[PDB]
Write a protein that binds this ligand. Sequence first.
Ligand SMILES: Nc1ncnc2c1ncn2[C@@H]1O[C@H](COP(=O)(O)OP(=O)(O)OP(=O)(O)O)[C@@H](O)[C@H]1O
Ligand SMILES: Nc1nc2c(ncn2[C@@H]2O[C@H](COP(=O)(O)OP(=O)(O)O)[C@@H](O)[C@H]2O)c(=O)[nH]1
Ligand SMILES: [Mg+2]
Lengths: 206, 68, 326, 352
Amino acid sequence: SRYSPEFKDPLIDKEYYRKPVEELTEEEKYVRELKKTQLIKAAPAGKTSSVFEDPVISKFTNMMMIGGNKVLARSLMIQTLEAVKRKQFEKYHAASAEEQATIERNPYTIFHQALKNCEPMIGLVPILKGGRFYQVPVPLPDRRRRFLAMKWMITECRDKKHQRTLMPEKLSHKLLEAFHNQGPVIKRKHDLHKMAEANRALAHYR
Amino acid sequence: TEADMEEYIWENSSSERNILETLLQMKAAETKEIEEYKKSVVSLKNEEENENSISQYKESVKRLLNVT
Amino acid sequence: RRMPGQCSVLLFPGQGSQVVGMGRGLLNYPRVRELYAAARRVLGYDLLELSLHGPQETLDRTVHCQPAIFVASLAAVEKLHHLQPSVIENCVAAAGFSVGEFAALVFAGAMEFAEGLYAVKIRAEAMQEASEAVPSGMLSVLGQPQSKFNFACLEAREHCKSLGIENPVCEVSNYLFPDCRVISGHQEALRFLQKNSSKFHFRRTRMLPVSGAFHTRLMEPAVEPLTQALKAVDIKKPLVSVYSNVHAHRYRHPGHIHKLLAQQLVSPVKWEQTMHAIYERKKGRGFPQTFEVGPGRQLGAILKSCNMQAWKSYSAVDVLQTLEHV
Amino acid sequence: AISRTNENDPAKHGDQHEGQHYNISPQDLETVFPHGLPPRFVMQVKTFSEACLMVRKPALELLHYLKNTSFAYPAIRYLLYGEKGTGKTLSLCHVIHFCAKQDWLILHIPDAHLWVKNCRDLLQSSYNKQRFDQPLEASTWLKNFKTTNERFLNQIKVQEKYVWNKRESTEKGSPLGEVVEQGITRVRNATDAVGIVLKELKRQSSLGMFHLLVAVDGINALWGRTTLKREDKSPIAPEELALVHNLRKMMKNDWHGGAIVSALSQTGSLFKPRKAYLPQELLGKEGFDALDPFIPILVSNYNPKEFESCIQYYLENNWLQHEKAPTEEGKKELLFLSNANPSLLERHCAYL
Ligand SMILES: Nc1ncnc2c1ncn2[C@@H]1O[C@H](COP(=O)(O)OP(=O)(O)OP(=O)(O)O)[C@@H](O)[C@H]1O
Ligand SMILES: Nc1nc2c(ncn2[C@@H]2O[C@H](COP(=O)(O)OP(=O)(O)O)[C@@H](O)[C@H]2O)c(=O)[nH]1
Ligand SMILES: [Mg+2]
């Protein structure tokens, strides 16, 4: 690494600094004073104090990226968001008066809820002890399941069975399916929760 | 060759022919203006084309064509 | 020396590329009417009328399609020479598929029109007789990474042995591009392969509209006739590098073309090997221009499957229409 | 609805309607604009279930020029120019909608760049063996021309016998619609049918039968270069295309009774840098000589009033779903990111 150990990661949170000194606790006052002495790394290209910034969508875009072509990944992400928005508007214009109150048109809300609906809380850990592999249930950390939902969504959208259907169109369809607890990603979560319930007797190996 | 030569001569030019034809047609339907028109044309043809030159040409053409 | 990019490689199509309207767009070009007149003189019927306006059923016949493709290929060569003299002047390699081989040699100055057309005629007639002798056919099979071709041919032969016939024939007849081959042999074996594609891991299967199993030992009776017709012909040294189909390498000495043109009749077509031998090179180095002189665009798709980068500089001569009336 | 104007009549818009959106009816949409609107504005029309155009200074000035136009003088050439995505196409659409409501005859070319690139059925004209026909591009335009000007096709009549082939000919005095039909039914004569129409419309308008508008978007294609090739892989010049050759005659001010309005476009242009937007740079010497004399009209980015009104329009259509968008900080961020460019603002708002 080209940064010395003294260098610390920057804090881009804009409203953190505007906090009144009166609200600051003694510990928070101390750490604010301490950061004065520390050296701070240059903020990386990426996160910004923008009010429209979304770390989850940024991570999804980075996970779609191939060969460092970030422009194309962000283009695909924004196209997916626009497609979801337009599909929801089309479904809203054609809905009954009482059905328009339960139709979400915010693409960010749909994206977050669809990813949350696919998060597995339990997983397996291959462990060979007696000469034969043994899959044991283990509770998944929050970061692990957040990553797994994204990875499953992207892998499902990268299947070759979808011939000539462009990535934004496939991803919008999968997101809207997972928003309603439907589709193959929700089934992949269910088949993991079931295959980890089928081996609850193997937890004693942990 | 005219390309090698560093001058667009407004005399005996397509701009002059077109404006002469247009004014003859206007008179049939019915100068300092032509001087400023040729100045703007020569500027746009020889110097750099900026929006100031474009606006000068616009004003000259409007005055010649009776557009307000 | 010349760099790759101003040189040119001419590819000649084979049987299965015939089409009604073939020949239109080439007639008004120089020297084509004389070639069709020579075709009439040698054959004994009006190839021109059949190629232009035909029922497509008389044209799909083996005795009629191959000479039509031959004459159309050479007419397209004449058209290309008229349009682009430099391309014909800067020619490095030539290759034909099954019958277009006879065209490439005639283009390379190893044969003249009359002898080549006579060879093609006798070849087509003998192949038609051989196909009539025993029921047979050709099946295009597109496999996946888990597909075993020799294995599947083995069970396809076991089926016919169980039914009971003398030495069932079912082997790969054409290597076109990766994981796609053309199997040839008795219709029972091909039906077995079609109905057991799922077990054999064949993504697609399509029976070819051909008379019989070409490029197999079943065509052996058609070897002795053609040989005699080739015996009289004096084959010269090709001026350009003409590639073979039996072993997919350049013809070296003219005295070996005589027997290779007969082995090609009863040997698999090594098209993928020929494409490698012509276009193989290191990454980054330039590729030559490619011109498909003849009907259809099948060789274009095959080259696309084989080499994308070589396919980037590929173009086809239009033998159905001409932009300008010369 | 501060961003909307109740005056949906383009003939009565003035400086007090600047920054306000006026509605185009579905009937006017399908009649006046089968092809004119930009591709990404049609998505907004389909999503909002309504077409609304902001009234801006370029369109107001070009409308004031067309209201005071003398129909005895030769037709005046108006050229809309500006940076990429500044709204010149929609200003031309506003002017076309104004002219249509006053029973003008509309000759609208939605994009002249399509005629000089990516043509798969290129033919050689039987009329003139040195030119090429584009039946697919000519027949597509003929149908929409028929749609826009269906009323006049029976009032307007030819003054010559046009011979499509030895069997078929259009006799003198037949309605112009027949000619259009012959171009729509048999594509082989589509390109020949377009030119005749132009030849008629330029002539009859001089007689005073009707007022003609020539609306050519992406006019810079006519005097540039083409990406179309012969069978010998040789380049083809724009003048060798009959469709392009006949449309140049309409840009010349050798006829009266109408106005010529055009808009430049680097989007889809051939052999032009991304940042070239000025008249000479995009037109070329030949194009400038052809159009000269002409009146250029500048189209710029949104001023603060227009930017605020556009964001209020999107908010009224509930098109900004992010919670921070309606706030003031989000408006500053959008203003900075787009720099008031209409196209960038629309694209950014599309996915928020
Ligand atoms: N008057 C307007 N009313 C509403 N939206 C507008 C207006 N002008 C511009 N826009 C917005 O800007 C987008 C781009 O406008 P337009 O297509 O007219 O640009 P242009 O300057 O002609 O572009 P280009 O240089 O690419 O040809 C439109 O789709 C619409 O989103
Ligand atoms: N098929 C056909 N097309 C015609 C006929 N007359 C004119 N046109 C077409 O309509 C266009 C009218 O343009 P025109 O005044 O004749 O200019 P020109 O081509 O130089 O002679 C021509 O370019 C032709 O393409 C005709 O009698 N038959
Ligand atoms: Mg435009």
